[PDB]
Amino acid sequence: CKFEHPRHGHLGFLPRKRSRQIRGRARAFPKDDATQKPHLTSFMVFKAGMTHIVRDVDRPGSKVNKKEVVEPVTILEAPPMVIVGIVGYRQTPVGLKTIGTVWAHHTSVEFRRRYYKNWKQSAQLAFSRQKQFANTKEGKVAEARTLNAFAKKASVIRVIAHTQLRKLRNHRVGVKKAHVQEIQVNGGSVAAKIALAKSLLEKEVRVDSVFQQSEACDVCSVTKGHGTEGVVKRWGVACLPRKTHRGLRKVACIGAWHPARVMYTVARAGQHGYHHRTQLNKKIYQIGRSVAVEPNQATTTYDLTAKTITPMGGFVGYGTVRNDYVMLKGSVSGPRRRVMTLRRPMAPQTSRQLKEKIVLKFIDTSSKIGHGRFQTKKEKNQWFGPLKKDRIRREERLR
Amino acid sequence: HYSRKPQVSSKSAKAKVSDLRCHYKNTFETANVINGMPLRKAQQLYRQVLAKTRCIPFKRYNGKIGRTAQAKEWGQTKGRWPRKSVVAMMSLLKNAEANAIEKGLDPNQMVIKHVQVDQAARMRRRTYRAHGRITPYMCSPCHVQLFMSEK
């Protein structure tokens, strides 16, 4: 008979436990349409940092129609992935079972370190017997039989892809063992999927071959961790009055007399953050090329200044974006340096917002350390001019 | 004098200490871990516990103690580094080694075969509580006996 308000938190994200993995993993793939061409559905990226952009909006009826807006964006570095294997799945009354794996003839050191805790001091025998066997005629026959089994019984075909940390030449991402994920091949018949996958073997796949610029994607990633947290932060319950004996930041009543136990719907202290999330409908604002190929990464048709996607001073705690990258509108779960998965969208992409063609007019590259007011180092140089240390440097130059 | 006997007494060395004045539970844990070890292996383990690179596994006297990664080699999660029990047991092992040397045995071959830690008679102190109450403050010393045999 009391005053009413909704409960705190979403019981569908239970338990608030630490995620089993640090990598974002797709728990489902888009519905497979056999009418389309065979195509990959996912890609692993690394979060570098955030900035903001200006664009004009194409949305008739809106008060911002034909008007500039500024959008925060997230930059995710996407070095190409390497396809090392093919797996097939057959459907049974108890769910999908993998038929087998067709391994590539050659694997990178980075892929093989994933099988070790201490690679440098190990014997480094991973895949050696497999190489010596598959190379022969009995091995060729076994591979042919596995491929024929894929053709005969598989309804689902996925590729085994791994990341290239040597190409992701990042100093703070300490890991050197490649990240491995199964990427599902959608489109076409099963034979067509197998042909695409077999062509992909031992090859590099670039993020622009999986995703196009103005499309949207879903992001699988794990959120930033906070360790043990109380109910106020973890659940959003109210703080108690100042007058409260023995503590304020808690739930006053954790239950009625009956049931004579505590329900699972009551907010408790515990792990907060480090949870897996799937975060659909992130618009791709840009798929950039690596700076060693195209250094004018942040240049647009309206801002002719030559600049890269890296802000002055670098991304804080991350460094330089050296590879291909993806500009996503808004935010994604997880901190910088964390590997994440971009998945082709599962929700229907027919709204005006999701179909809108994105054209960037300005990309902010000012310092992310302390109220950056210069877009480029040349702008700062022309503000300040000759400083004392530059004069000393020239004085040394003349002698 | 000991609850058990060596299989061969000419190839064994004994040592015991009574009313040790270490904590009985900690000494129980510290002495039990070396029960079937070679003497040198046990002495190295104690030296490394003093250096806190290895730990004493705490089984049965571990109610609400901390978890540590050094307890994994013993198949446990809970362990500690009880320096006082450790140094007392090092002294006891030195005495056992001396007894072995006197008997003409090689300490490099002796295997600890028997370790028993018991609760000795308790010493009484008192502590002062709220509302004028006096409440006990006891010390729990221990007896330790061991023998080792040539492999």
Partner: protein, 180 residues
Amino acid sequence: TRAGMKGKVLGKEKKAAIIDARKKAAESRKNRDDKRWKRVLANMDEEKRKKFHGVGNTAKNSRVRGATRASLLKRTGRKPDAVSMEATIHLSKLLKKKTFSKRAPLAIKRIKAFVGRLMKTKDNRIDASLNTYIWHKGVKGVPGRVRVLIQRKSEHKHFYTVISNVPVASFKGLTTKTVE
């Protein structure tokens, strides 16, 4: 280390042989790639040659693309028992947000740990000058940097270090040096 890499299990000879085998494998890869990249770059055109940036170790102020930096390190050998070096320690990076009444004792412990890791010594003695310098602005006013003189000596063989203050007017431009 693992059993197959333990010094007391393989012995000197086998440990050396396995080490040289790994090195010669890495070296064979490095030389093959060196020759291949040199000739592939040579027989390429100017548009492509400039398109390729510093692949074949062409660009200045770069690492050697062939191998690791530590593999290029010349291993002079055994350091002598008695050795002396002068080094700056960035104390403020270690003492940031530390409880004010603990700053100077913490600085002493951090200096001991720093030197002990540098010299493989657990007996690290603080000379009166260094303790006086660390404490000379009270407990919470430890200087952000200190230049210390480290003298290892011997007296099995027992190694210990004597750490003393080096008064400096400025810390700019000072790196780690060996003193005789």
